[PDB]
Amino acid sequence: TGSFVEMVDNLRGKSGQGYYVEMTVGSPPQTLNILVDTGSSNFAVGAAPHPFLHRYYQRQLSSTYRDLRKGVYVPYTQGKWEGELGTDLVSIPHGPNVTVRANIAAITESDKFFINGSNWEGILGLAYAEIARPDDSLEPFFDSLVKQTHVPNLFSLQLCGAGFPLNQSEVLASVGGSMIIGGIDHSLYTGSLWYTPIRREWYYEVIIVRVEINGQDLKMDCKEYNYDKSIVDSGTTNLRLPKKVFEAAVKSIKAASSTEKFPDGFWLGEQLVCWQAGTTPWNIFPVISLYLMGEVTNQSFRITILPQQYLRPVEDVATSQDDCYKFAISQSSTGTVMGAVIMEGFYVVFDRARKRIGFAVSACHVHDEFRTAAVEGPFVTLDMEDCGYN
Numbered sequence: 001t002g003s004f005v006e007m008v009d010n011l012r013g014k015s016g017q018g019y020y021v022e023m024t025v026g027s028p029p030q031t032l033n034i035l036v037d038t039g040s041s042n043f044a045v046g047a048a049p050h051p052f053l054h055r056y057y058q059r060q061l062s063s064t065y066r067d068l069r070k071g072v073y074v075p076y077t078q079g080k081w082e083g084e085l086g087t088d089l090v091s092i093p094h095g096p097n098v099t100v101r102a103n104i105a106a107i108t109e110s111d112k113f114f115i116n117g118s119n120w121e122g123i124l125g126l127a128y129a130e131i132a133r134p135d136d137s138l139e140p141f142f143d144s145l146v147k148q149t150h151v152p153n154l155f156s157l158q159l160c161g162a163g164f165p166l167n168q169s170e171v172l173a174s175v176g177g178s179m180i181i182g183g184i185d186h187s188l189y190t191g192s193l194w195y196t197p198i199r200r201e202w203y204y205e206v207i208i209v210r211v212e213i214n215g216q217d218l219k220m221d222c223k224e225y226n227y228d229k230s231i232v233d234s235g236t237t238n239l240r241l242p243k244k245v246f247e248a249a250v251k252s253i254k255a256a257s258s259t260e261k262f263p264d265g266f267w268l269g270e271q272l273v274c275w276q277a278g279t280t281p282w283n284i285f286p287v288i289s290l291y292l293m294g295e296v297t298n299q300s301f302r303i304t305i306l307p308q309q310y311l312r313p314v315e316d317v318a319t320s321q322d323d324c325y326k327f328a329i330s331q332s333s334t335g336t337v338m339g340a341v342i343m344e345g346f347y348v349v350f351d352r353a354r355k356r357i358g359f360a361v362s363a364c365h366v367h368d369e370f371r372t373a374a375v376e377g378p379f380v381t382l383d384m385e386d387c388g389y390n
């Protein structure tokens, strides 16, 4: 650990639209806001006009451009981007102060990929080469940065949700957090770092062993928590959970928050819920705890999130006083996805060199006077490798 003072407060954005870092590409430098995505492995940037892009990468204006003369087709969940592969010199201004040659995918066509008014123009895929496209021989950005410079094979992410909804303009003002490249910044967390092993180097896959709602165990075969696979994914908004796990949690959260009642749509993430300015009854909503496999035999540790995390602020401007929120937990056929919602509670260390992911309580996590996110351990769990789906 130490102090990485230029890289602190370098991200902007929100859970609904993603978090981005300023990068430059080419000679002379072309500035672009790039989404930080731990759930993919391509460095891909808008390279042609699009209604939602205010600017883009212009290969014709860069002396250091080289065409790799291959195309790339990445289907997204719904829609796609299509790219022309190449290489160019790449920097991060509020970054490690080193320029590297990297594979860049010049996006030329795309559908349902860019977000309207998002203020990012590309994607920095930080995952491993195994899920890069067209295949693993395309070296990802981070692999290249390590090999070309002296930077340690490790990065860390502090995503900072504000307590309230942010406009298009306010996202640029409001600080969104920190990506630390090549290290761990001691001032971005309190208490201790607890590490879970990375199960496989493709996505950042982890093993969840136990789940609690206000200390109340969900009491399932822990294969159901990792049903298919569990991942840490900055490019996903919600905490996504498998079907059986999702329903059991919703029932448990409903019951704990029974002081009030909410429509069925709220629990399916569609309808807003709204209280008067400041009177959000956080105390009636329960904390959610995920136990992760520790790197010692028969040890787990616990990350605990608040309703401040799993209820995203979203404005309506129908009575502009009210504080409104959407339910930021949802169903998955992927297995568990620990999106921005979860990550906004914690400082997450991606220790690729030692094949593990660290968790600590974020200094910027949103909370009231009487509660706070936690990272706690150890806990003697038995048969934790049987929680893995294989």
Ligand SMILES: CN(C)c1nc(N2CCCC2)nc2ccccc12
Binding pocket: 015, 016, 017, 018, 019, 035, 037, 076, 112, 113, 114, 115, 123, 235, 236, 237
């Ligand atoms: C930031 N997340 C939520 C993303 N949203 C969308 N939008 C969802 C509706 C249209 C596109 N596209 C992405 C593409 C890559 C990585 C993250 C995201």
Ligand SMILES: [Cl-]
Binding pocket: 236, 237, 238, 330
């Ligand atoms: Cl989502």
